[PDB]
Amino acid sequence: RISVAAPRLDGNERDYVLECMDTTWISSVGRFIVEFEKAFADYCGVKHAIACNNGTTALHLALVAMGIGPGDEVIVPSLTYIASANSVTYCGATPVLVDNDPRTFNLDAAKLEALITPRTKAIMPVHLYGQICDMDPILEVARRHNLLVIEDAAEAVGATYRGKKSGSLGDCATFSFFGNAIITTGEGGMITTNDDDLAAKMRLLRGQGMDPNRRYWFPIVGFNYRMTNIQAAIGLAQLERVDEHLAARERVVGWYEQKLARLGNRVTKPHVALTGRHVFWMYTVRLGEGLSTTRDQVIKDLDALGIESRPVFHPMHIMPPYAHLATDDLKIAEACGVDGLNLPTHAGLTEADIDRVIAALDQVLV
Amino acid sequence: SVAAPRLDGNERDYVLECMDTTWISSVGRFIVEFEKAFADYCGVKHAIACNNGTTALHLALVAMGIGPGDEVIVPSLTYIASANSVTYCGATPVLVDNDPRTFNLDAAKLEALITPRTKAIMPVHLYGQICDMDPILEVARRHNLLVIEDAAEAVGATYRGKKSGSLGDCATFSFFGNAIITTGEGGMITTNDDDLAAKMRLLRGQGMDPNRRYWFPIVGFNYRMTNIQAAIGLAQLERVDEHLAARERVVGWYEQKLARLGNRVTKPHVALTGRHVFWMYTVRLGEGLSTTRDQVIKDLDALGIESRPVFHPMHIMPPYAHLATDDLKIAEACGVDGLNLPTHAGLTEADIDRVIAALDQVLV
Ligand SMILES: Cc1ncc(COP(=O)(O)O)c(CN[C@H]2[C@H](O)[C@H](O)[C@@H](OP(=O)(O)OP(=O)(O)OC[C@H]3O[C@@H](n4cnc5c(=O)[nH]c(N)nc54)[C@H](O)[C@@H]3O)O[C@@H]2C)c1O
Ligand SMILES: Cc1ncc(COP(=O)(O)O)c(CN[C@H]2[C@H](O)[C@H](O)[C@@H](OP(=O)(O)OP(=O)(O)OC[C@H]3O[C@@H](n4cnc5c(=O)[nH]c(N)nc54)[C@H](O)[C@@H]3O)O[C@@H]2C)c1O
């Protein structure tokens, strides 16, 4: 069996976790937290990193700290994982869906301007599959409208864009450390920012809105979105070998790049923009429109051959919760939801492994 | 330490099993095993593990249909999450006073607060003591209201032969580091209602349709517990009686020495409706005293003795001051004079004494 993603706990994870257990610091109180944060902040080259329980709560906490609320509009790509839009909804705000680029799958900056209104407060570029959005044109449209930018970098730890790491481009950014992620904590998330004020607000809200100086004295309504010492310990040990893990994944992409040619025009290989490092959290192809099969059957057929795969997201506006947000200008997102396929991408796959997926695809793409 | 975890069971092993098999996220068999074991322990049909006690309250309320325009009765005297959870739904907390001895929701003050908007009542079992449920459940029945127990601090408590978590339409617990059963951070919802449980599971899991990769029929949350968390909780639950017994010992100790103290403090009232687990041993400091409750904490600390104030009621703090009424006097009185003394399984009778050295050397 070839799994689509899998962690590679080949560092201090086990030992750092035993330290947690042995010292009994297993809750959201512990040394690993601030250490994983600091190390994470260094890695992104930002001033602050705020560890959360998951990528979804990281998004929600960031938005609320940014002051997003009822009446506000936040521009979000329709093609993304639902938490991007849900996080806006939790705030009482309205997601304003935008189309993406047919090759990078990312928010198409040329389509932003027209979506801007008196209620717009922020734009949420989402760096799908490990590739960062074309940030230059996005920030200049934002700057021109005095809008905030929050990167949804859930799937992009380690990616770079014109010398800056994902996480250091927008006013703030969030990451996920779910089990299939480049860096995992089992479940976990992180917000990054260089804004002191924003960081304090996030921390205050993350820790139940409690006055740090007054036990049980709460100036505002907050949340319980803290990460545990155990999650942080695993995260620390993972980031410790982030380069190694990134290398392994690049090793895999190369095989894909080297052997995909075998399928000819049957798939479109992921386009890599030349702006910085694409970390390939997943290697995603667009199946040729010529095939007779459907993307879903291919998924079935690969599974039947003992090969895991995932569909590129169903766009927000085609699903029940956000169908009310549909517009006539979300066509690339739909096209992409129909023909995209994430292929197995993880540090444990072997050349052979790849050969197997390629052979399976050669076989199933018809 | 006012509280501390007691990891003297299979926690480490169960955790190394998640590391060793690599199931460390919110997929692992420990999650369902812990839920099953916990449900059985509570004597209920379903248990839904969550990432903490606060999200467990939120999830429960949302799954109960609580929303904008609804009202939920909540004691002013409680941990803030009880009220915030209602706020998250866009609902309005309607504060009620508590009993001066048990610190729990005063059932006699309930019917007066019911309105056309009331959809539920949230009795909070503070300090390991279950509210006086009978009346609470009748008033609710009478008004067709739902009851959600915030049982965060009361795992193992019993009321008339029934365990906390099995009395209302649903209930929630917290497994924070200082709890009777801990998972580091973690929570659970219990219920006998199949519909409710299904809805809670759907929402807990990002609203995803379990049979369609990335197909979501509703807006959910990411409120899942990790396999590692459930592994720790399964292990702790395994030794629940053992941990409860240890607390009982510490308790018998306080009880038997509090006396030296006479009346500069008031010992915790224990209702005889079932077992009081004493997540914390809480006294109300004596009226006459020249010092202040926070000075006692302060002093207590300098002496290297950790303690916590009984909660400041919601209505006196900024987020909920607009909900103040003139009939939350007991809450305020308790917030003023209440004190939780270190209460945990790793404390010694010596520990106690010394706690007491200071309590005598400090109640002025
Ligand atoms: C743009 C964006 N924004 C925000 C978010 C939200 O972040 P978060 O999920 O709240 O942290 C996300 C989150 N995206 C992830 C989510 O975290 C989500 O959970 C995930 O859905 P999934 O594909 O259905 O996840 P899965 O089927 O549970 O796990 C995928 C593979 O990873 C493996 N795996 C997961 N956990 C483990 C583990 O602990 N151990 C091992 N060995 N394998 C694991 C599974 O066995 C599968 O092979 O994939 C999504 C694309 C995002 O993409
Ligand atoms: C009625 C009610 N409803 C809902 C909730 C919310 O549930 P949750 O917190 O969302 O799970 C709660 C939550 N109550 C707890 C909260 O979970 C909470 O965080 C806690 O606040 P705190 O007093 O400020 O907690 P602390 O100072 O961080 O920890 C207290 C002691 O426990 C220790 N401790 C915590 N975690 C660990 C650990 O992992 N290991 C060790 N050795 N000690 C630990 C600390 O060092 C302290 O000595 O006390 C509150 C009463 C509740 O009471």
Short mmCIF file of C-alpha atoms in Angstrom, two decimals, chain A residues 15 84 236 239 254:
data_model
loop_
_atom_site.label_atom_id
_atom_site.label_comp_id
_atom_site.label_asym_id
_atom_site.label_seq_id
_atom_site.Cartn_x
_atom_site.Cartn_y
_atom_site.Cartn_z
CA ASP A 15 12.51 11.32 22.70
CA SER A 84 -10.25 29.09 4.61
CA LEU A 236 10.18 21.02 17.27
CA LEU A 239 11.33 21.43 12.06
CA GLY A 254 12.25 14.62 -9.44
#
